[PDB]
């Protein structure tokens, strides 16, 4: 019945929020909290995605953690992903629902992102793995592969606490006083221009019901104990703004209507716009202490809203966001400039860094297998440290890649003049990242099938599914002579191989090297080369 | 003209008036007659 409460949102989302907090919750039982958990589950599929906004907001904060209070919200996100896929991932959008905001899709490659790193620096738990076994597979999946972040930063980051950064222990400039003086007196000069444009004349006595700020005076009457307790944030924000790394400076040497008016069109680049919606969320940091400082002898209830102003809404972000950006035209245009990469989309895009991260990973797992086959022929140590490194490997990296390539073969095999997806097509570099990807596999397994054990039918069919995925004309034409020299390693590698092969059935020698040569080919080289092969001739 | 404060509490009444032996059409604001004017030839027909 759910459907189409579109109207009533704002008490789905609250209703979604209890039952989630409920379902976090202390002395509740496991039938009361399975019972919770069902009633989350059916009430998010039948709930229009755009309405789980907030949920996959708080999901974003809490999930991460790997808690043990992140398996029901594993599943909730997987079955969201998979049934709604369509939405986030297809411009057009699941029909009748919609497309995604963007504020969506940026907190869902936070999402992964976060599971990603955590289940890496995490050790094995075979029901932590067996939860993201349904993986970030469905959000890779939703997330188109050419996605673009407008919002590219590091959090620098780690119940949430941000610590400010107090001058007090050193001096204070005095230059740096008068310019906070000078600050106050204009904000004031606006807002009595905002008063002055809003049609509505200040009163002279005290009238609530005239609903204009009573304070509205002549300044030569206007009181300093207002300035002098508005202080105390005016300095807070500029010590916080020394702080971190951001220097002012009179860029020129020195010996009531605006004259530079307030302009919208007047442009700023993306790191000055990094700098500006920082400063909103340091503001929003010493709003969230302050808010503590008040709620400490409450303790509970906390406040929805206090989240970063990246993760939530713009629009709500857009009164501070107009703000900073008023108050940097102010600084550039009185000459005090603030000072303290230019990654391209394609960098940018979501399919860049996942690749980036297997390749490492790749590197990683030809580490941890030449230590292995080291400390095999001598000295076995049963410890294997690495173990968690190849669990998350094994366990995660290749049901990932396979299901990922699955769903994304067109997008990497489409070309501007031939697109065979829907919408998109790969970057020149994402296909050699993949190509390498491939090959560095192949190498992988090469002559090591055996130590893979069981998870060697997995590396064969994501080499399989790889394989597909090349667009081997575009990396042999225009592409680096590394991943160029690659390529034709793993040609020649299989060629050797099989002649190898041909001449133990030749019996030239008996037939330890020749198992391994054997096994290695009839299990993986011979089904892979034919796939290439195949899509190669298709 | 408003530098500000576009949004108006108030509605705006604008009166169309034509003369159907003259061919004179004129328009006002809120009882302000408006300067523009329109001559139309006999036979016409309009539809508001």
Same mark, same amino acid.
């Given at each position: ?202 009163? %002279? ?6 609903? #204009? &700020? !009573?304070? $509205?005076? /002549? *300044?030569? @009457?206007?009181?300093? +104990?207002? =300035? ?65 400082? %008040? ?6 209830? #906390? &406040? !929805?809203? $206090?989240? /970063? *102003?990246? @993760?939530?809404?713009? +629009?709500? =972000? ?221 | ?48």
């Amino acid at each position: 019945l759910f459907a189409g409460t579109e109207h009533r949102a704002i008490m789905v989302d609250s209703m979604l929020h209890t039952v989630y907090r409920l379902s976090r919750g202390r002395s509740l039982t496991k039938a009361q909290r399975d019972v919770i958990e069902d009633c989350l589950m059916a009430l998010c599929r039948y709930i229009r995605p755009s309405m789980l906004q907030h949920l996959l907001r708080r999901l974003v904060f809490d999930v991460p953690i790997l808690n043990e209070f992140a398996k029901m919200p594993l599943k909730l996100l997987t079955n969201h992903y998979e049934r709604c896929w369509k939405y986030y991932c297809l411009p057009t959008g699941w029909a009748n629902f919609g497309v995604t905001s963007e504020e969506e899709l940026h907190l869902t490659r936070k999402l992964f992102w976060g599971i990603f790193d955590s289940l890496a620096h995490k050790k094995y738990d075979q029901e932590l793995y067996r939860m993201a076994m349904p993986c970030l597979c469905a959000i890779a999946g939703a997330l188109p592969p050419d996605y673009v972040d407008a919002s590219y930063s590091s959090k620098a980051e780690k119940n949430f606490d941000p610590r400010p950064v107090e001058t007090l222990n050193v001096i204070i400039p005095e230059k740096l006083d008068s310019f906070i003086n000078k600050f106050a007196e204009y904000t004031h000069e606006k807002w009595a221009f905002d008063k002055i444009q809003n049609n509505w004349s200040y009163g %002279e006595n005290v009238d609530e019901e005239l609903k #204009t &700020h !009573p304070m $509205l005076r /002549p *300044y030569k @009457t206007f009181s300093e +104990k207002d =300035k002098e307790i508005y202080r105390w944030p005016i300095k807070e924000s500029l010590k916080a703004m020394i702080a971190w790394e951001w220097t002012i400076e009179k860029a020129r040497e020195g010996e009531y209507n605006p004259q530079p008016p307030d302009l919208s069109g007047v442009t700023l680049s993306r790191e000055l716009q990094a700098m500006a919606e920082q400063l909103a969320e340091n503001y929003h940091n010493t709003w969230g202490r302050k808010k503590k400082q %008040e709620l400490e002898a409450k303790g509970g209830g #906390t &406040h !929805p809203l $206090l989240v /970063p *102003y990246d @993760t939530l809404t713009a +629009k709500e =972000k857009a009164r501070d966001r107009e703000k900073a950006q008023e108050l940097l035209k102010f600084l550039q245009m009185n000459g005090y400039a603030v000072t303290r990469l230019d990654t391209s989309s394609i960098e940018k895009r979501f399919a860049f860094g996942f690749l980036q991260q297997l390749l490492r990973w790749m590197d990683i797992s030809q580490e941890f297998i030449a230590h292995l086959e080291a400390v095999v022929s001598s000295g076995r140590v049963e410890k294997s440290p690495h173990e968690q490194e190849i669990k998350f490997f094994a366990k995660i990296l290749l049901p990932l890649i396979n299901q990922y390539f699955t769903n994304h073969c067109l997008y990497f095999l489409s070309t501007p003049a031939k697109v065979l997806g829907s919408g998109g097509h790969a970057s020149n570099k994402e296909k050699e990242m993949i190509t390498s990807l491939f090959c560095k596999l192949a190498a992988l397994v090469r002559h090591r099938v055996s130590l893979f054990g069981t998870d060697a039918p997995a590396v064969v069919n994501c080499l399989h599914i790889l394989a597909r995925s090349l667009d081997a004309r575009t990396v042999m034409k225009s592409g680096p002579e590394i991943v160029k020299a690659g390529l034709r390693s793993f040609f020649e590698s299989a060629s050797e191989d099989i002649e190898k092969m041909v001449e133990n059935l030749r019996l030239g020698k008996v037939s330890k090297g020749v198992g391994q040569n054997l096994t290695y080919t009839t299990v993986a080289l011979l089904p892979v080369l034919t796939t290439l092969f195949q899509h190669i001739a298709q | 003209p408003g530098q500000q404060g576009r949004i108006s509490h108030t509605d705006l009444v604008i009166g169309c008036l034509v003369d159907l032996a003259t061919g004179l059409m004129t328009f006002t604001a809120n009882g302000k007659e408006s300067n523009t004017f329109f001559q139309v030839e006999p036979n016409t027909k309009l539809f508001p």
